[PDB]
């Protein structure tokens, strides 16, 4: 009895921490773009 | 002078918004790719699991019948 | 011996390519909204 | 004249930003739905797998004990 | 025969409905920020 | 007067855009955490499933060989 091998099934991981950091950085830096007449 | 200030602030804000939307698009693309790969992985696991339980079943029925023959 | 059937378990897929394309299109088109006094 | 230009560019940019935020909201909603469906799928698979290994176990113990009786 | 227990394997769920609601609310409220000279 | 209107509308829009980008960042972070947890869960399930099929196999081969000895 030889059961099918399933060890090859792999689930990838996502790494969007750069993009989240950029989004928070922009949400903070947009205060430097407010108009103060 | 105030118009130049408004224009410069608006251009800076639009540049930052462009960078942020490119970042959001890249992040959504990566998340889509990873979620779809994980979905394909779960589906392939379900298929192989169904096949393996089918095999394990058939083997167990062979055992049970041949042991009924035994006893 | 009748093992439980699990073939019904399905994992959906997401299709947000329209939205990603729209986001990149806007990130490109926002150059047409810059002020050139 | 420059004020009309600033206002028109700002209105165009705000319209594009509205469209882009609607797109981001729709994309995040679709991703949430799909990730939650996949989570429910993995949980249901874990439950059914636990049940099936319980059954396979009990059957194997029956086999082992009744074969200990045999020999 | 004691098979390994896997009942502890759990898959979390995400709840970003607050953020999606905020995004749609902003996409609707940005009409209150258009300039009408 | 029109400049004050443009500046006020632009500041309101930039505040709303900041809130929306913070929301998008929080949503992407939550989605990343959940997708990564589900990936780790599927990987751990695959490992435990491989181990359990290995054990079930070895047991079935024991049964088959010892029943070949029987008959």
Q: What is the 3-state secondary structure (H, E, C) of chain A?
A: CCCCCCCCCCCCCCCCHHHHHHHHHHHHHHHHHCCCC
User: Which residues of chain D are within 8 Å of residue B46 when distances are taken between CB atoms?
Assistant: 45
Residue for token pair 């073939």: C7
For residue B69, what are the contacts with CB-CB under 8 A and spacing of at least 6? none
Q: Could you give the CA distance from residue E31 to residue B1 in angstroms, rounded to a whole number? A: 28
Residue B64: which of A3, F69, F67 has the closest Cα? F67
CA contacts within 13 A on the Cβ side of D63? 26
D 3-62 residues with CB below 8 A of E? Answer: 3-4, 6-7, 10-11, 14, 17-19, 21-22, 24-25, 28-29, 32, 35-36, 38-40, 42-43, 46, 49-50, 53, 56-57, 60-61
Separation CA A34–CA F10 (nearest Å): 7
CA distance F50 to D36: 26
Quote helix, strand, coil % in chain E, to nearest 5: 45, 0, 55
Give the CA count within 13 Å in the CB-facing half-sphere of F66: 13
Residues F41 and D42 sit within 8 Å (Cβ to Cβ) = yes
Chains with ≥3 CB–CB distances under 8 Å to A: B, F
**Which residues lie below 8 Å from residue F31, measured CB to CB, with a gap of 6+?**
B31, D28, D31, D32, D35, E14, E16
CB atoms within 10 A of CB D58: 12
Distance of alpha carbon B10 from the chain centroid: 38
Minimal CA separation from B70 to chain C, in Å? 18
Cβ distance of C35 and D6 shorter than 8 Å: yes
Give DSSP secondary structure letters for B22-56. HHHHHHHHHHHHHHHHHHHHHHHHHHHHHHHHHHH
Chain D touched by B2 (CB under 8 Å): no
3-state helix, strand, coil in chain D (%, to 5): 95, 0, 5
| Residues whose CB is less than 8 angstroms from the CB of residue C31 and which lie 6 or more positions away in sequence, other chains included | B18
Task: Report the alpha-carbon distance of residue F38 to residue F24 in Å, rounded.
Answer: 21
Give burial (CB, 10 Å; 0-12/13-18/19+) of E33: buried
Cα distances (Å, whole numbers) of residue B58 to A3, D3, D32, D45, F54? 12, 80, 40, 21, 17
The whole-angstrom separation of Cα D6 and Cα F3 is 10
Write out the two tokens for F66: 């010892």
Sign of CA dihedral B19, B21, B26, B30: positive
Contact, C10 vs B60, CB < 8 A? no
Cα end-to-end distance, chain E, whole Å: 81
Per-residue CA distances from B59 to B54, C2, D51, F56 (Å)? 9, 12, 19, 11
Q: What distance in Å separates the CA atoms of residue E26 and residue D17, rounded to the nearest whole number?
A: 10
Chains D and E touch (3+ CB pairs under 8 A): yes
Give the technique used to solve this structure.
cryo-EM
């Amino acid at each position: 009895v030889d059961l099918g091998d399933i060890s090859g099934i792999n689930a990838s991981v996502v790494n969007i921490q750069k993009e989240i950091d950029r989004l928070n950085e922009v949400a903070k830096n947009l205060n430097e773009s407010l108009i103060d007449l | 002078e105030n118009q130049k200030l408004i224009a410069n602030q608006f251009n800076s804000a639009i540049g930052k918004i462009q960078d942020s939307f490119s970042s959001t698009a890249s992040a959504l693309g990566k998340l889509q790719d990873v979620v779809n790969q994980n979905a394909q992985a779960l589906n392939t696991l379900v298929k192989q699991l169904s096949s393996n339980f089918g095999a394990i079943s058939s083997v167990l029925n062979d055992i049970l019948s041949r042991l009924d023959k035994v006893e």
